UniProtKB/Swiss-Prot annotation, chain A:
<dbReference type="GO" id="GO:0042803">
    <property type="term" value="F:protein homodimerization activity"/>
</dbReference>
<feature type="binding site">
    <location>
        <position position="33"/>
    </location>
    <ligand>
        <name>substrate</name>
    </ligand>
</feature>
<feature type="binding site">
    <location>
        <position position="5"/>
    </location>
    <ligand>
        <name>substrate</name>
    </ligand>
</feature>
<comment type="subunit">
    <text>Homodimer.</text>
</comment>
<feature type="binding site">
    <location>
        <position position="46"/>
    </location>
    <ligand>
        <name>Mg(2+)</name>
    </ligand>
</feature>
<feature type="short sequence motif" description="Nudix box">
    <location>
        <begin position="47"/>
        <end position="68"/>
    </location>
</feature>
<dbReference type="InterPro" id="IPR015797">
    <property type="entry name" value="NUDIX_hydrolase-like_dom_sf"/>
</dbReference>
<dbReference type="InterPro" id="IPR028613">
    <property type="entry name" value="GDPMH_Gmm"/>
</dbReference>
<keyword id="KW-0479">Metal-binding</keyword>
Swiss-Prot record, chain B:
<feature type="binding site">
    <location>
        <position position="48"/>
    </location>
    <ligand>
        <name>Mg(2+)</name>
    </ligand>
</feature>
<dbReference type="InterPro" id="IPR020084">
    <property type="entry name" value="NUDIX_hydrolase_CS"/>
</dbReference>
<dbReference type="GO" id="GO:0009103">
    <property type="term" value="P:lipopolysaccharide biosynthetic process"/>
</dbReference>
<dbReference type="GO" id="GO:0042802">
    <property type="term" value="F:identical protein binding"/>
</dbReference>
<comment type="similarity">
    <text>Belongs to the Nudix hydrolase family.</text>
</comment>
<dbReference type="InterPro" id="IPR028613">
    <property type="entry name" value="GDPMH_Gmm"/>
</dbReference>
<feature type="short sequence motif" description="Nudix box">
    <location>
        <begin position="49"/>
        <end position="70"/>
    </location>
</feature>
<feature type="binding site">
    <location>
        <position position="68"/>
    </location>
    <ligand>
        <name>Mg(2+)</name>
    </ligand>
</feature>
<dbReference type="GO" id="GO:0000287">
    <property type="term" value="F:magnesium ion binding"/>
</dbReference>
Length: 150, 151
């Protein structure tokens, strides 16, 4: 419920999984964020881990939901623990959002997905101002340094 | 800072984020502390604590190593030891709802006499103990390190 989720966001870091998904063309999958935080920006697919949900089950649920292809956690290469801080939140601009993010990287076949979404090369996404800094960071050497698990 | 009612809502609705410290001394023994409040009251756990809103992992590590161990250590002193998950059938305020932690483990070695109840236990001791909680024993079991992200 929304009154409670507002309280959650105001009060504590959310836990999420982010997916660095590569196709056969060396491009990476991005999705447009329709709502706050970082509204209108393009982001790697992912989502938050639910109360009492295992990382294994979250991974399977989120790949299915976000990619249209259910993968197990063992299919993903762990890509470190990341931290995202936004000045706004899903409900507006009264409080900040804080994500603690488990990144995973894997390679897929474009054709085998139930998917707006776009495929961008490393170079194109890094030069794209419509892709959020928090997603471009995954592809920057300077940002990977000091990330637990990398 | 959070009021009782809001932290209850938090614990009820979402996973908490914590750092757990696997702290080794000179003798190859590991630091464990007795929990005196819920959840899992009475069991012995590695030191640690939850990451707070808008706090970086780096700042949390420094704050928690000082709070828990009496020695302020930077995150760089710790060996990242995987992402774990701890589920408790109770919570800080009773048995009406569960607690869920997503845990970042960190391993490091200390001089025992330099730190500020507690016990130093070998892995063989802690693993054979019925008072050391399963969530803490898992760090020292081979079957448990399989499939842990970051290990």
């Amino acid at each position: 419920r929304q009154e409670d989720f507002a309280t959650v966001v105001r009060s504590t870091p959310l836990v999420s999984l982010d997916f660095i998904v590569e196709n056969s063309r060396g491009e990476f999958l991005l999705g447009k964020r329709t709502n706050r935080p970082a509204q209108g920006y393009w982001f790697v697919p992912g989502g938050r881990v639910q109360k009492d949900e295992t990382l294994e089950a979250a991974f399977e649920r989120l790949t299915m939901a976000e990619l249209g292809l259910r993968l197990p956690i063992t299919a993903g290469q762990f890509y470190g623990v990341w931290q995202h801080f936004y000045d706004d939140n899903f409900s507006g601009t009264d409080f900040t959002t804080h994500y603690v993010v488990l990144g995973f990287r894997f390679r897929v076949s474009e054709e085998e997905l139930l998917l707006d979404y776009r495929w961008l090369t490393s170079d194109a996404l890094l030069a794209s101002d419509n892709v959020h800094a928090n997603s471009r960071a995954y592809f920057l050497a300077e940002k990977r340094t000091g990330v637990p698990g990398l």
